[PDB]
Amino acid sequence: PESERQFREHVRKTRMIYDSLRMFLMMEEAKRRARADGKAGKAGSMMRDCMLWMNRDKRIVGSIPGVQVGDIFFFRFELCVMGLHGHPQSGIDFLTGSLSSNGEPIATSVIVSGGDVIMYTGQGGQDRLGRQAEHQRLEGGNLAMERSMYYGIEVRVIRGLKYENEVSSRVYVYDGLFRIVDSWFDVGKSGFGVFKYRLERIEGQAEMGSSVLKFARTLKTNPLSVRPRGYINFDISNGKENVPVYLFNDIDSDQEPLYYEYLAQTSFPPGLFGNASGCDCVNGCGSGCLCEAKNSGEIAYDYNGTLIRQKPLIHECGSACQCPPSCRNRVTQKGLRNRLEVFRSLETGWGVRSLDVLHAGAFICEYAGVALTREQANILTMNGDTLVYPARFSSARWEDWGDLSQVLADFERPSYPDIPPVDFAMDVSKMRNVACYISHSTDPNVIVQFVLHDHNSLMFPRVMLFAAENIPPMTELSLDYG
Ligand SMILES: [Zn+2]
Ligand SMILES: [Zn+2]
Ligand SMILES: [Zn+2]
C-alpha cells in the first residue's frame, strides 16, 4: 500500500523532530557525555507533552506502522517516542487492556541484550545493578509474558548492543516479531526463582538488523571470514583518505572504479587560490564571534560536529581563524573518517554503503571532482562530455531538519539568506572520490551543503555530504541529483 509510505513518512518527520529537539537541548545546556541520556529523556518527555509520540496508548500489538525491521535507535526513550517500547528501564513492556486476553495483561515488547531463538529471563526482584536478589513472581511483566504465550501474541523484540556510534554509548535495533512458544520456572546459582520464556521469530520477515550490525562490524575486523570472495580492493582511495575505501563485487568481474584516479578533495582551476579575516576564538568558536556573523548569526554545527539545520552556504573556520582544530566550526575540513564500501549492483551500476553507523546531520564526506569555469565546462560540453551540476542536487526532502515549531510555539527558524545559486560544473569522469559512486534517488538519505574552508570564493564552494537520518550500516546511500 501507499498508506505504508504515509506511515513511513510520519515516522521520518517524528524522528527529525526528536533528534532536532535533543540537539537543541544540548545547545542550550552547552551555551552555559552523560548529558546525552538525560537530554534524550527530556526530549522524549517534551514530545510526550505535545502529543507527538506514536502508539501512546500502547494498544498496538505486533508491527508499528512506519517502523521497519533494521531501524536503529540510540536511546531507550527514543523507543518510547516511536511506540516500540514504553518502559525505558524495564525489559518487558505490556498492555493491560483486552482484545484477545480478557482484559488480561499481555506483553507487547521486550528489550534483549546482545550476546533465531531467544532464551529470555523474566524481570523483577533485582537490585540497582540488575542482580537477582529475591525470588521472581508471576506478576506484572512476567505474567504478561505468560499470557502472551497463551494467546499467541506477536511480541516486538528490540536488541540492545554496545555498538560504535557518535551519539550515545549503545545502539538499539528493531528485529521484528517473535512469539513466545514455551515458559518455565528456573533457578540460578544464586538460588532465587526466576521465570524463563522461549521466543521464536515469526517466519517470512526481513533480515534482522542485529545480524546486519554484526556483519558490518565483522567486515571492519575480519571481512574475509564472512566474504571470502568479492573484495577486489580494500582501499581504492589508495591511502589518499585517512580511512580505507572498500571495493566489493560479488556479481561479476567489472572493476571500473579502480580505473579512475582517486581524488579525495575537489580540484579547483589552477590560479584561483590570499586575503580574508578569521575569528579570534582561541578556545574554540562559541557565540557572538565574526565567523558566526558570516553564518547569518548561527554556527552550522553543534559541539558534536553535527549539522543543526540546512543553510545555502557554510563558512567554516580557516587558517585566518585563531581557534584550534577542535573548534566546532571545522567539521568538513577533517575529510572522510567513516569506513565506506563501493559495491557492484544491478539496478544501479555501483553503489555506496557505510560499515559505520551514520547519525542524522552527521558529515559523511566531500563530493570530490574536477571543478570547471564556464569556459572550460562549455568546451568539454561541446565535445559531448557529461558534467555534474551540484546546483541541481536537492535536499528539499529534509528541509524540516532543525525545525522545533511543533514542540516550541515561539520557535523561529534562523535566517536562510537569499544568495546567488552555485553555477559551476564538475567533471567526475577521470578523477573522483567514493562519493561519486553514490546512486540517484528521489528519496535520498543524504543531503548536500555548500562549504567554504580552505578558500573564500563564493563562486566555488565545496560540495559536502551529510547523513539526513540515522542510517544503519549496509544501507545504501542516495542523493537526489535533480
Ligand atoms: Zn569563532
Ligand atoms: Zn572556530
Ligand atoms: Zn573562525
From Swiss-Prot:
Localization, UniProt: Nucleus; Chromosome, Centromere
Keywords, in A-Z order: Centromere, Chromatin regulator, Chromosome, DNA-binding, Metal-binding, Nucleus, Zinc
Domain (Pre-SET): residue spans on this chain: 277-335
GO annotation (BP), single: gene silencing by siRNA-directed DNA methylation
All copies of domain SET, residue ranges: 338-482
Binding site for Zn(2+) 3: 285, 317, 323, 327
Domain YDG span(s) in chain numbering: 62-201
Entry comment, domain topic: Although both SET and pre-SET domains are present, the absence of the post-SET domain may explain the lack of methyltransferase activity. Besides, the Cys residues in the SET domain that normally bind a zinc ion are not conserved.
Known function: Histone methyltransferase family member that plays a role in gene silencing. Together with MORC6 and SUVH2, regulates the silencing of some transposable elements (TEs). According to PubMed:19043555, the protein does not bind S-adenosyl-L-methionine and lacks methyltransferase activity. Instead, it may function downstream of DRM2 in RNA-directed DNA methylation, binding to methylated DNA and recruiting DNA-directed RNA polymerase V to chromatin.
Oligomer and partners: Component of an RNA-directed DNA methylation (RdDM) complex that contains at least MORC6, MORC1/CRT1, MORC2, SWI3D and SUVH9. Interacts directly with MORC6, MORC2 and MORC1/CRT1. Interacts with SWI3B, SWI3C and SWI3D.
UniProt name for this protein: Histone-lysine N-methyltransferase family member SUVH9
Taxonomic lineage of the native organism: Eukaryota, Viridiplantae, Streptophyta, Embryophyta, Tracheophyta
Gene behind the chain: SUVH9
Portion of the full-length sequence here: 138 to 637 of 650
